[PDB]
C-alpha cells in the first residue's frame, strides 16, 4: 500500500525538511525560497525525475530521485531518502523495486547506478539483495562529516532486472 | 445512451491526470511529456488555443466522469487525426466504448470535416482490435516494435476509417 | 414580448453564451477566433472586451430569464455594414420572440449605430426561417453554394440584407 | 434642493452611471473611450482614475438617494475651458433639481477649478432645455448642423457657453 | 508568362505591397486590421507572420520584376473556403498575366491547400473582370447590393465562386 | 499643384511635424495628448500608431519637398464627423496650395472614409482664411466666443462645416 | 536677439548635467534629487510627459548651448509657476539674461496662459535682484534662512510678476 | 487639551482625511498628487506609504474622538525645512485646540525630526489665524500677492516661519 | 560519394533548406510548425535551436557543393524511434548518392544516437524509391490508405522501418 | 586639478577592480554581474553616495564613499580608496578635504566619522592633520588578515570644519 | 521565570507600542517607520533577513515584558549591537540585569558571536554603571552622535567579548 | 615548449573542429550540442560558470595542439574529471604525457583540488597503461557505461590524489 507519484509543488516543504549541501538540477540551495524558484525554473527539465512515496493515509514516507539522466547512454543515478520516522519498517526494499520498475519498464533506461558509503555496509548489502553489483570503490570521493570517505558505485542493468524470475 | 461529450476545461485536469496514473505508458500533452499535475497544468495553460489536439470529457446523466475522447496530430491540410479513448477503470465492461467511438467519429466527420481518423491498438489486445473492426476501422499497418510498453517493445495495429465510409 | 429587453453582454453572461452553442453542432467563433471550451471563451472575452468589430446583446424577459442572444459581427465602420445573427434558447423557441428581436437588432443597428446595411446567412434547407426574414424586410442577394460544412455535408445558404433607408421608411 | 449635495465619483457609483445610460439611446464615452457594458466601464474607470481631463460628481439628497450626475469633460488647462453635461435620473426629473445642479456645476467650475469658459450641447428639438440654460446665463454661440446621429436621423444642436466673469457677476 | 513565378511573401516585399495600395483608392487590411502607412503595415506583418488565416504570394517574372500579388484571406480550415484577390501592378496590366495568375492561385488552393471553395468579389461596374473570372470557371452566387462604399458611392459587387471538384476536372 | 501628393504619415515624418509647430506659438496635441519636444512626440506616435481617431497625410510635391500636413482629428465613426486642419510650411504659403489641399482632404474624407460631416475652426481675426474656406464650400455654424487663449488673449473662432452630400453634388 | 528657445530633448541632458557641475546647490528633476548623469537620465525617462515642469534650452544662431529656462511647480488651478534661468559660465556677462527672462515671460503669459510667475534670488546677489526688478518683478517676500548654500543658511527674495502687468 | 494625542496616520484614517477636505472648498493633494475621490486617495496612500517628503499625524482626544490633522509637507532634508498645515474638524473648532497642536507639531519637527525651519501659508483675509500663529512665535517673511485662487478670486497669503533655534530654549 | 560528408545544420544553411522545398509542391514543417516563407523559417530556427526532437544534417561534397539534407524528425527518447527523410537537390539526383546517404543516416541513428527503430513514408506511386529503401534493409510495415493530400488527390504511402539490431552486425 | 564627480554606471569596472568582502548598500557581492544588478537597484537610494576621483587626463585616481547616511542625526561614515598606482602622490589630503567640503557645504551634514586600523598609524596621523579626532578605540572590531584588529573611530563636525580659518 | 522567544508577526503590535513611549525615531532593518502599516510592510520584506534578531520577553503568565534586539549582526567580524527595551510597567523589577545576561548567553553560546556592543547616553551615567557591572567596558565616547530630544548628545560605546563572558 | 591558456570565445571554432573527428556526442556544461551555433549559445550562457575549466594547448609557433578539460568540478569534495584531446595532426609526438602532467599541476598546485579522475575505454588497454604510468590507479570498472560506436562499452575510472601527485 505504498505508492509513488510524481513530485508536485506542494511537496517542496517535505523535500526541504528531508535535507539540512543540497542541489536542484545541479543548482545549490539552502532556503525554501531558493528551492521554490529552482522548482519553477526546472519543472519541464528531463535531466532529473522525482517521486514522493506515500502510504494509504497519505503520510509522506520518502523520496525517489533519478538524476544525471542521459538519453543516449540510457543511464541515471538513483537515490532514495526515507524520512527518519519511517526507517526500519522495511520500506526500502519495496521502494527500490518500484524505482527500478519505473526506470526499466516505463523510462526504458538501460542502466541504473548509485553511490553508497563504504562505512554503511548495511545499505550495501541491501542494494546487493535488490540485484545491484559493485562496479567501483571510489577512493576518498566525498568529504562527509569532517573527512574524505570511500563510496561504492553499484549498478543494475535493464535486461538483468526484467528477467530476474525467468 | 445518456452519455455526453463536452470540451475539456481546466477543472478536468485532475481527472485527466488520474486517468494516466493507472496507465502503463508515459503521457504527452501537445507532444510535450509530463508526469506531474503541475507539469500538466503549465502545458494546459500554454496550449489552450492550440488546434492540433482536441479533447472531450465523457459524462453520464449524474455527471460521473466516465472517460476521455482525444484527437491528436490533427492536420488541416491532409484532414487527418489520431483518435484515442480512455475509459476510467470503474466504467469499463459496461459497453460504453462502442457509443463513444461513434460519438468521436460523428464529431470528427460531421463537425470537424476531417477525411481520415486513425488509431493505434496493441496487437496483444485482439479484443480491442475486433471492437474497432466492428465500428468500421480497417487495419492499414502492423507496426513492428513501435512502442516500449511494460518492459518490452510491442507491435501495434494502425487502423483507419474514412469520412465517406462513415457517412454512408 | 413588449417586455423583452436587450442589454450589453457582460462577463457573467459567458456561461449562457457557451450553453447556447452546446445545442448547435457548429463551430463557434469569438472575434473570428474559434473556441470549444468555456476556458477558451473566457480568455477570448478578456482579450477583446474593448474591440468594436463585434457587439452582443443578451435578451431577457421581465423575470430575467435568459431568452437568447443578438450578435452583430464583422462590423465595418467605412462601409457601415455588419452581419447579424440571433440565437434563441431551445426552451424559448416557437413563442414568437424571433420577430421582436430581429426588429430590436435592426433598430439598434440603424437608429443608434448608424449602419447602412445589415446582412445574414440562413440555411437554404430552412425555408421557414427564410420566409420569416423576408417578412421582416430582408431580401435575398446571394445563394451561396456549398458555403458551410454542416452536419456531415456542404450546404447552401441564402445571404439576405436590409438597408438603413428601407428600414427607417417602413 | 438646498439639501442636494455633489460628491466626487467613486468606484461604487459606476452601477448608477451605467444605469443612467441604459435609458438614453445614445452612445456613452469614458475619457473619449466608447463603452456599452458595465465590464467595459469598470476597466475604463480603473485606467483613468487619476486622469484630470474629466471630472464627475454624483448628486445625492439628504437620504443619499442617487439623484443624478454632473460631468465636466474635455477640460483643457491652457484654454481653461470644459464641456458640461448633466443627467438627472428619470424618477427625479420635474422636481426643479436641474437649475440648482447647473448652478452647482458652474460654481465648482468657476470658483474652485478656475476655468474661464463652460460650454454644452443641447438638441435643437429640445427648446425647453435651451430656454432653461438661457435662464442660467448660457448664450448660444453655435447652431451645429447635423452634428449627431440620434434616434434614426442627423440632428442639429445648439452650442451654448457662459464665461467665468459673467457667472461671477450674476450673483453680485 | 509560363515564366511567371509565385513565391511566399517576405518582409522585404512589404514596400511593394504598400505601393500596390497607393494606386487603388480603397482601404487596406492585413489579417482584418486596417492600415494606411508602411509603419503600420510593418507592425502588422510582424504580429501575424505565423498566422494561417491569410496567405500571400508575390508574382515575379524571369528577371525578378515585381508583377503583382495573389492573396488568399478568410481561410477557414473547417469549411475549407477562402477569399481570393489578385493585384497586378499598373505597368504589367494588359499583358495577359491575369488569366495565368488566377490559374496559379487556384492550383495552389486546390492541389496543395486542399480547399473546397474559392470565392471573390468583383465590382458590378467592372463587367470585363466578371467575364474574365467566368472564363476561368467562376460562377456568380451573389449580387451584393450596395456592399462597399467605393469612390463616393455605395456599389454592388458580384460574389463568384469555384469548387475544387470543378477546377480539378476542367483540366482532365 | 496637380503634382501635389498626399501620403500617410510615417515615423520618418515626425521631424517635419515637429518643425511645423515650432513656428506656430500654439500648443500641439497628438491624439489629445499635449507635447512640446520631439522625444514626447515620438513616444506618442509609437503609442497611437494603430489608433484610427486621427489620420494624417504629409503633402509632397514632385521633387519630394515637404509642403505641409492634412490632419483629421476627433474622427467619430457613429456620427461620421471629423475636425480638419491644414498646416502649410512657411516657405510654401502664398503659392495657391491651400485650395488644392482642402479639396484633397475633402475628397479623401467623403469618397474614401465615407464621413458625413467635416468641420474646422478658424480665427475670427483671420477673415481672409474664413473667406477662402467659404469659397471651398464651408459654411459658418458657430462663432465661438473666447474659445482659445492665443497670443496673449482669448480669441473667437468660426466653426465651419461642409456635408458629404453637398461636396459630392457640387 | 538671435537667441532661440526650444523644448528640452534627451540629447540635452549632458548639457543640463554640466550646468550643475559648476553650481553650488543640489539639483532636482521633478522634485527628485540627483547627482549623477545616470540618475538624471532615469528621472528624465520617468517624467517625460509630466506637465508640472517645462524646460527650454537656449541656443544662438550657430547652435552653441547658451543656457536653460526652467518653469517648475506649475500649478494649473492657481496658474502659477516658479521660474529659473541658468546661463553657461562662458556666456555670462554678454547681456543675455534680460532677453531670456523676457522670452520665458512671453511663453508663460502668452502661450501657457499662466497668471503669476515667481522666482527666488539670493539676497547676497543684489545685482540679480535689480535686474529682475527692471524686468518688472517685485519683491513679495524676504525668506529668512530658506536655503543652505555654500556652508550657511541664506536669505532669498521671492519676486513675482503677474500676467496682467506683463501684457500691458 | 493636555489630553490630546498625535499618532502617525494609518490606512484606517483615510476616511477621516477625506472627510476633512469636503467642507474646505479647495483642491487637495497627497504627495503633490491631486485627488477628489476616496478611491484616488487610497491609491495615492498605497503608492507613497514609505515616502518621507510628507508626514501626517491624526489628533485624538482621551475618548479617541477624531479631532484633526497635523501635516508636514515639502520636507527637504538638505535645507531642513518643511511646510506645516493643521486642520481641525468643524465640531472641534473654538475649543482652543489649535495652540496646543501647533506646539506639538513644532515639538516633533524640532526635537525629533531635527528640522531647521517650519513655515506655513495663511490667508491675509484671515487676520485671526495670523495673530494666533504670531503668538506661537511665527513671524511674517512674505506677503504673497494673488498666490491662490480661492473661492472665486485670487487672494494674498502670508508666509510665516519659525526657526529651530528660536523655538528651542536654553540653563 | 565516399567523398560526401554530413554536418550539423547551421543558421547559414536555412537558405538552402528553404530552396529545397520550393520545387517539392508540399507543405513544409519545422518542429511540427508549418512555414512557407524564409522569414517564417528563420524565426522557427531561432525558437527551436536546442530542441532535440529533430536533427538535421546538410550533405556536402569535397568542393562544398550543397548536395542535400538528411532529417530525423519525431525523435522519441522513450520508444527510441524517429522518422527519417532525405532530400537530394534536383541537380544531384541520379548520381547514386541516395544509397550512401541513407546508410550514413542509419549509421548516425544507430551507432551514435542509440535509437531502436527508424521509419519513413514513401509514396506508393513511387515504386522505385520503395525498392531502393528495401535494398537498404527497410521493410514495409504499413500501407497507409489516403494518408496525404498530394498534388490534387489523396494518395497511399508505405511506412517502412528498420531496427537497430538488424542494421548492426556481429565476430 | 583633481576632480570629484558622482559615480556612473561606466565606473563600476573601476569599483570592482578596486576590491578583491565587499558590500553595495549593505548587500554583499563578489562578481561584476552582481555589482551591476545592485547598482541598478539602488541608483536613487540616498543612504550612500559615491564620487570617483579623476585627474586632468581623466585617469581614475580613487573613490570617495559616504555610507550609513542618516538624515535625522545628519551623520555619515566616510571611506576613501586610492588606486595602488596613485598612492604616495599626496592626493589623500586633497580628497579628504573635497569630501568634507561636499559633506558640509552641500549635503549639510553635521558629523563625518571613519574607521582606521590601529596598525596603520600613518593614516591615523593624516586624518588628525585633516582635523579628525579620535572618539573611540574599538577593540577587536574587525577580522582582517587572519586576526581580530583594533580600529580608531575618528570624527569631525560641520562647525569645526567650516570655521577652521576663522 | 522570564523567557525569550523569537519574534513573530503577532508581536508587531507590541513592538509598535514599545516605541510610542520613546521620543526617538524607530528603525526596522535600518529602515525608518512611524506607523504600524509601515512596520508591517517592513516586517514582511525582511522576514528571512539575518542581520537582525529579536526576542520578546515574557513572564510565567505570558505578560509582555519587553524586547531583546540584536542588530547590525555581521557574520564575518562576528559582532552585533545589542539593545533592550522594558515596557514601562515592568521597569524597576530588576529585569534588566537578567535580560542582559540572557542576551549575552544567546549571543555567545548559540550564535557564536565574538563581540557584543551597545550605545548608552553619556547623560545616563546610571545605565553606564549598570552595563559596567554586567562586564561591558567603554571603547568609545561618540561626540554629538545622535540628535535626541532637541540637542546633539554624546554616547558611550561599550563592548564585551565572547572569551570574557564565557570565562 | 607547449603552453596552456584559458579558453576564449575565439577558440570555439577549434573546440568544435576537435569534435568533428570524434564519433561521440559532445557536451558543454552537461548540455549536448552538434552545431557551432548551438555551441556558441552554450558558451555565452556558461561563460562565468566555474564547474568546468578549459585550456587550449599551443606550441611556440601558436599552432593549436589540443585541449585540456576539467569538468564536474566540485568545490566541496574538491574533485574534477579530466579529459585531454590532441588534434589528429599532433598525435604521436608524446604530447599526451606532458599535458597530463600540466593538467595535474594546475589542478593540484593552483586549483587546490584533492582528487582528479578520468574515464578510459576498457577496449583501449594502451591508454589505461599510459595513465597508470602517470600515477593514476583504477577505482572502478564501469559496466556498459556508455553507448559508443554501436555498442555498450565498459570504462575504467582512474584517479590520482593531490597528496600522491605532490610527493
PDB file of C-alpha atoms in Angstrom, chain F:
ATOM      1  CA  UNK F   1      -0.166  71.733 -57.912  1.00  0.00           C
ATOM      2  CA  UNK F   2      -1.855  68.928 -59.849  1.00  0.00           C
ATOM      3  CA  UNK F   3       1.585  67.494 -58.891  1.00  0.00           C
ATOM      4  CA  UNK F   4       0.987  67.655 -55.096  1.00  0.00           C
ATOM      5  CA  UNK F   5       0.544  64.247 -53.415  1.00  0.00           C
ATOM      6  CA  UNK F   6      -0.815  63.128 -50.036  1.00  0.00           C
ATOM      7  CA  UNK F   7       0.644  60.118 -48.301  1.00  0.00           C
ATOM      8  CA  UNK F   8       0.015  58.525 -44.934  1.00  0.00           C
ATOM      9  CA  UNK F   9       2.273  59.822 -42.174  1.00  0.00           C
ATOM     10  CA  UNK F  10       5.321  57.644 -41.268  1.00  0.00           C
ATOM     11  CA  UNK F  11       7.760  57.670 -38.312  1.00  0.00           C
ATOM     12  CA  UNK F  12      10.351  59.466 -40.509  1.00  0.00           C
ATOM     13  CA  UNK F  13       7.895  62.394 -40.950  1.00  0.00           C
ATOM     14  CA  UNK F  14       7.787  63.269 -37.208  1.00  0.00           C
ATOM     15  CA  UNK F  15      10.693  65.736 -37.562  1.00  0.00           C
ATOM     16  CA  UNK F  16       8.716  67.653 -40.166  1.00  0.00           C
ATOM     17  CA  UNK F  17       5.548  67.560 -37.969  1.00  0.00           C
ATOM     18  CA  UNK F  18       7.576  68.865 -35.058  1.00  0.00           C
ATOM     19  CA  UNK F  19       9.200  71.648 -37.143  1.00  0.00           C
ATOM     20  CA  UNK F  20       5.737  72.684 -38.393  1.00  0.00           C
ATOM     21  CA  UNK F  21       4.716  73.571 -34.783  1.00  0.00           C
ATOM     22  CA  UNK F  22       7.904  75.471 -33.882  1.00  0.00           C
ATOM     23  CA  UNK F  23       6.672  78.424 -35.974  1.00  0.00           C
ATOM     24  CA  UNK F  24       3.165  78.454 -34.575  1.00  0.00           C
ATOM     25  CA  UNK F  25       3.027  79.645 -30.910  1.00  0.00           C
ATOM     26  CA  UNK F  26       0.168  77.298 -30.026  1.00  0.00           C
ATOM     27  CA  UNK F  27       0.228  74.112 -28.027  1.00  0.00           C
ATOM     28  CA  UNK F  28       0.311  70.938 -30.014  1.00  0.00           C
ATOM     29  CA  UNK F  29      -1.558  67.680 -29.318  1.00  0.00           C
ATOM     30  CA  UNK F  30      -1.184  64.113 -30.616  1.00  0.00           C
ATOM     31  CA  UNK F  31      -4.353  62.045 -30.089  1.00  0.00           C
ATOM     32  CA  UNK F  32      -5.441  64.617 -27.463  1.00  0.00           C
ATOM     33  CA  UNK F  33      -2.078  64.284 -25.605  1.00  0.00           C
ATOM     34  CA  UNK F  34      -0.052  67.571 -25.353  1.00  0.00           C
ATOM     35  CA  UNK F  35       3.652  67.612 -26.333  1.00  0.00           C
ATOM     36  CA  UNK F  36       6.397  70.199 -26.839  1.00  0.00           C
ATOM     37  CA  UNK F  37       9.522  68.087 -27.519  1.00  0.00           C
ATOM     38  CA  UNK F  38      10.399  65.740 -30.370  1.00  0.00           C
ATOM     39  CA  UNK F  39      11.002  62.977 -27.761  1.00  0.00           C
ATOM     40  CA  UNK F  40       7.484  63.408 -26.391  1.00  0.00           C
ATOM     41  CA  UNK F  41       6.061  63.349 -29.945  1.00  0.00           C
ATOM     42  CA  UNK F  42       7.969  60.170 -30.764  1.00  0.00           C
ATOM     43  CA  UNK F  43       6.602  58.320 -27.703  1.00  0.00           C
ATOM     44  CA  UNK F  44       3.070  59.471 -28.568  1.00  0.00           C
ATOM     45  CA  UNK F  45       3.498  58.352 -32.170  1.00  0.00           C
ATOM     46  CA  UNK F  46       4.559  54.828 -31.010  1.00  0.00           C
ATOM     47  CA  UNK F  47       1.645  54.596 -28.590  1.00  0.00           C
ATOM     48  CA  UNK F  48      -1.078  55.624 -31.077  1.00  0.00           C
ATOM     49  CA  UNK F  49       0.207  54.153 -34.358  1.00  0.00           C
ATOM     50  CA  UNK F  50      -2.908  51.938 -34.941  1.00  0.00           C
ATOM     51  CA  UNK F  51      -5.409  54.316 -33.389  1.00  0.00           C
ATOM     52  CA  UNK F  52      -7.972  55.500 -36.012  1.00  0.00           C
ATOM     53  CA  UNK F  53      -9.418  58.505 -34.156  1.00  0.00           C
ATOM     54  CA  UNK F  54      -6.904  60.685 -36.077  1.00  0.00           C
ATOM     55  CA  UNK F  55      -5.459  60.457 -39.583  1.00  0.00           C
ATOM     56  CA  UNK F  56      -2.555  62.444 -41.046  1.00  0.00           C
ATOM     57  CA  UNK F  57      -1.211  62.934 -44.525  1.00  0.00           C
ATOM     58  CA  UNK F  58       2.004  64.666 -45.452  1.00  0.00           C
ATOM     59  CA  UNK F  59       1.857  66.744 -48.595  1.00  0.00           C
ATOM     60  CA  UNK F  60       4.763  66.465 -51.066  1.00  0.00           C
ATOM     61  CA  UNK F  61       5.500  67.940 -54.489  1.00  0.00           C
ATOM     62  CA  UNK F  62       7.050  66.116 -57.490  1.00  0.00           C
ATOM     63  CA  UNK F  63      10.585  66.675 -56.070  1.00  0.00           C
ATOM     64  CA  UNK F  64       9.562  65.366 -52.599  1.00  0.00           C
ATOM     65  CA  UNK F  65       9.742  68.798 -50.958  1.00  0.00           C
ATOM     66  CA  UNK F  66       7.722  68.728 -47.740  1.00  0.00           C
ATOM     67  CA  UNK F  67       4.830  71.089 -48.443  1.00  0.00           C
ATOM     68  CA  UNK F  68       2.567  70.631 -45.412  1.00  0.00           C
ATOM     69  CA  UNK F  69       0.170  68.479 -43.424  1.00  0.00           C
ATOM     70  CA  UNK F  70      -3.504  67.474 -43.690  1.00  0.00           C
ATOM     71  CA  UNK F  71      -4.930  66.331 -40.323  1.00  0.00           C
ATOM     72  CA  UNK F  72      -8.276  64.754 -39.490  1.00  0.00           C
ATOM     73  CA  UNK F  73      -8.868  64.564 -35.742  1.00  0.00           C
ATOM     74  CA  UNK F  74     -11.790  63.646 -33.447  1.00  0.00           C
ATOM     75  CA  UNK F  75     -12.976  61.147 -36.060  1.00  0.00           C
ATOM     76  CA  UNK F  76     -16.189  59.651 -34.743  1.00  0.00           C
ATOM     77  CA  UNK F  77     -17.452  56.610 -36.667  1.00  0.00           C
ATOM     78  CA  UNK F  78     -21.057  56.721 -35.330  1.00  0.00           C
ATOM     79  CA  UNK F  79     -21.742  60.377 -36.090  1.00  0.00           C
ATOM     80  CA  UNK F  80     -19.347  60.172 -39.069  1.00  0.00           C
ATOM     81  CA  UNK F  81     -17.734  63.531 -38.379  1.00  0.00           C
ATOM     82  CA  UNK F  82     -14.171  64.835 -38.080  1.00  0.00           C
ATOM     83  CA  UNK F  83     -12.265  68.037 -37.478  1.00  0.00           C
ATOM     84  CA  UNK F  84      -9.958  69.055 -40.303  1.00  0.00           C
ATOM     85  CA  UNK F  85      -6.773  71.135 -40.076  1.00  0.00           C
ATOM     86  CA  UNK F  86      -4.174  72.028 -42.655  1.00  0.00           C
ATOM     87  CA  UNK F  87      -0.654  73.379 -41.989  1.00  0.00           C
ATOM     88  CA  UNK F  88       1.376  74.654 -44.923  1.00  0.00           C
ATOM     89  CA  UNK F  89       5.112  75.177 -44.276  1.00  0.00           C
ATOM     90  CA  UNK F  90       6.052  78.925 -44.173  1.00  0.00           C
ATOM     91  CA  UNK F  91       8.122  78.706 -47.398  1.00  0.00           C
ATOM     92  CA  UNK F  92       5.146  77.251 -49.333  1.00  0.00           C
ATOM     93  CA  UNK F  93       2.409  79.685 -48.257  1.00  0.00           C
ATOM     94  CA  UNK F  94       1.002  82.139 -50.851  1.00  0.00           C
ATOM     95  CA  UNK F  95       1.501  79.654 -53.730  1.00  0.00           C
ATOM     96  CA  UNK F  96      -2.190  78.675 -54.004  1.00  0.00           C
ATOM     97  CA  UNK F  97      -1.617  75.189 -52.482  1.00  0.00           C
ATOM     98  CA  UNK F  98      -4.288  75.693 -49.775  1.00  0.00           C
ATOM     99  CA  UNK F  99      -7.304  75.296 -52.059  1.00  0.00           C
ATOM    100  CA  UNK F 100      -5.919  72.118 -53.661  1.00  0.00           C
ATOM    101  CA  UNK F 101      -5.155  70.548 -50.278  1.00  0.00           C
ATOM    102  CA  UNK F 102      -8.512  71.445 -48.794  1.00  0.00           C
ATOM    103  CA  UNK F 103     -10.133  69.708 -51.788  1.00  0.00           C
ATOM    104  CA  UNK F 104      -7.872  66.623 -51.435  1.00  0.00           C
ATOM    105  CA  UNK F 105      -8.784  66.364 -47.739  1.00  0.00           C
ATOM    106  CA  UNK F 106     -12.479  66.593 -48.535  1.00  0.00           C
ATOM    107  CA  UNK F 107     -12.093  64.078 -51.300  1.00  0.00           C
ATOM    108  CA  UNK F 108     -10.467  61.567 -49.023  1.00  0.00           C
ATOM    109  CA  UNK F 109     -12.970  62.268 -46.199  1.00  0.00           C
ATOM    110  CA  UNK F 110     -16.040  61.931 -48.385  1.00  0.00           C
ATOM    111  CA  UNK F 111     -15.166  59.438 -51.131  1.00  0.00           C
ATOM    112  CA  UNK F 112     -12.938  57.011 -49.157  1.00  0.00           C
ATOM    113  CA  UNK F 113     -13.627  57.362 -45.396  1.00  0.00           C
ATOM    114  CA  UNK F 114     -17.354  57.848 -46.055  1.00  0.00           C
ATOM    115  CA  UNK F 115     -17.674  60.584 -43.414  1.00  0.00           C
ATOM    116  CA  UNK F 116     -20.821  62.683 -43.276  1.00  0.00           C
ATOM    117  CA  UNK F 117     -19.513  65.993 -41.908  1.00  0.00           C
ATOM    118  CA  UNK F 118     -16.161  67.788 -41.838  1.00  0.00           C
ATOM    119  CA  UNK F 119     -15.750  70.879 -39.643  1.00  0.00           C
ATOM    120  CA  UNK F 120     -12.865  73.239 -38.779  1.00  0.00           C
ATOM    121  CA  UNK F 121     -12.020  76.212 -36.590  1.00  0.00           C
ATOM    122  CA  UNK F 122     -10.614  79.465 -37.984  1.00  0.00           C
ATOM    123  CA  UNK F 123      -9.572  82.618 -36.100  1.00  0.00           C
ATOM    124  CA  UNK F 124     -12.151  85.394 -36.455  1.00  0.00           C
ATOM    125  CA  UNK F 125      -9.122  87.720 -36.746  1.00  0.00           C
ATOM    126  CA  UNK F 126      -8.177  85.903 -39.949  1.00  0.00           C
ATOM    127  CA  UNK F 127     -11.103  86.919 -42.260  1.00  0.00           C
ATOM    128  CA  UNK F 128      -9.011  86.007 -45.355  1.00  0.00           C
ATOM    129  CA  UNK F 129      -8.875  82.354 -44.299  1.00  0.00           C
ATOM    130  CA  UNK F 130     -12.630  82.446 -43.482  1.00  0.00           C
ATOM    131  CA  UNK F 131     -13.422  83.665 -46.981  1.00  0.00           C
ATOM    132  CA  UNK F 132     -11.159  81.027 -48.576  1.00  0.00           C
ATOM    133  CA  UNK F 133     -12.964  78.211 -46.686  1.00  0.00           C
ATOM    134  CA  UNK F 134     -16.308  79.757 -47.745  1.00  0.00           C
ATOM    135  CA  UNK F 135     -15.212  79.522 -51.389  1.00  0.00           C
ATOM    136  CA  UNK F 136     -14.309  75.866 -50.796  1.00  0.00           C
ATOM    137  CA  UNK F 137     -17.960  75.343 -49.704  1.00  0.00           C
ATOM    138  CA  UNK F 138     -17.651  75.585 -45.905  1.00  0.00           C
ATOM    139  CA  UNK F 139     -20.419  77.478 -44.083  1.00  0.00           C
ATOM    140  CA  UNK F 140     -20.261  79.116 -40.624  1.00  0.00           C
ATOM    141  CA  UNK F 141     -22.274  77.162 -37.993  1.00  0.00           C
ATOM    142  CA  UNK F 142     -20.719  78.803 -34.914  1.00  0.00           C
ATOM    143  CA  UNK F 143     -18.897  81.898 -33.685  1.00  0.00           C
ATOM    144  CA  UNK F 144     -17.179  80.515 -30.596  1.00  0.00           C
ATOM    145  CA  UNK F 145     -16.640  83.236 -28.021  1.00  0.00           C
ATOM    146  CA  UNK F 146     -13.204  83.399 -26.379  1.00  0.00           C
ATOM    147  CA  UNK F 147     -12.642  79.724 -27.287  1.00  0.00           C
ATOM    148  CA  UNK F 148      -8.834  79.763 -27.313  1.00  0.00           C
ATOM    149  CA  UNK F 149      -6.091  81.605 -25.490  1.00  0.00           C
ATOM    150  CA  UNK F 150      -3.791  82.552 -28.375  1.00  0.00           C
ATOM    151  CA  UNK F 151      -1.001  85.099 -28.316  1.00  0.00           C
ATOM    152  CA  UNK F 152      -1.765  86.768 -25.015  1.00  0.00           C
ATOM    153  CA  UNK F 153      -5.593  86.947 -25.248  1.00  0.00           C
ATOM    154  CA  UNK F 154      -8.789  84.927 -25.606  1.00  0.00           C
ATOM    155  CA  UNK F 155      -9.903  84.862 -29.240  1.00  0.00           C
ATOM    156  CA  UNK F 156     -13.092  83.998 -31.074  1.00  0.00           C
ATOM    157  CA  UNK F 157     -13.117  81.307 -33.765  1.00  0.00           C
ATOM    158  CA  UNK F 158     -15.567  80.455 -36.515  1.00  0.00           C
ATOM    159  CA  UNK F 159     -16.663  76.849 -36.694  1.00  0.00           C
ATOM    160  CA  UNK F 160     -17.291  75.991 -40.319  1.00  0.00           C
ATOM    161  CA  UNK F 161     -18.629  72.781 -41.808  1.00  0.00           C
ATOM    162  CA  UNK F 162     -19.403  71.015 -45.057  1.00  0.00           C
ATOM    163  CA  UNK F 163     -21.509  67.867 -45.526  1.00  0.00           C
ATOM    164  CA  UNK F 164     -20.779  64.839 -47.704  1.00  0.00           C
ATOM    165  CA  UNK F 165     -23.948  65.315 -49.796  1.00  0.00           C
ATOM    166  CA  UNK F 166     -23.038  68.944 -50.549  1.00  0.00           C
ATOM    167  CA  UNK F 167     -19.418  68.142 -51.524  1.00  0.00           C
ATOM    168  CA  UNK F 168     -20.368  65.159 -53.722  1.00  0.00           C
ATOM    169  CA  UNK F 169     -23.057  67.064 -55.712  1.00  0.00           C
ATOM    170  CA  UNK F 170     -21.028  70.200 -56.325  1.00  0.00           C
TER     171      UNK F 170
END
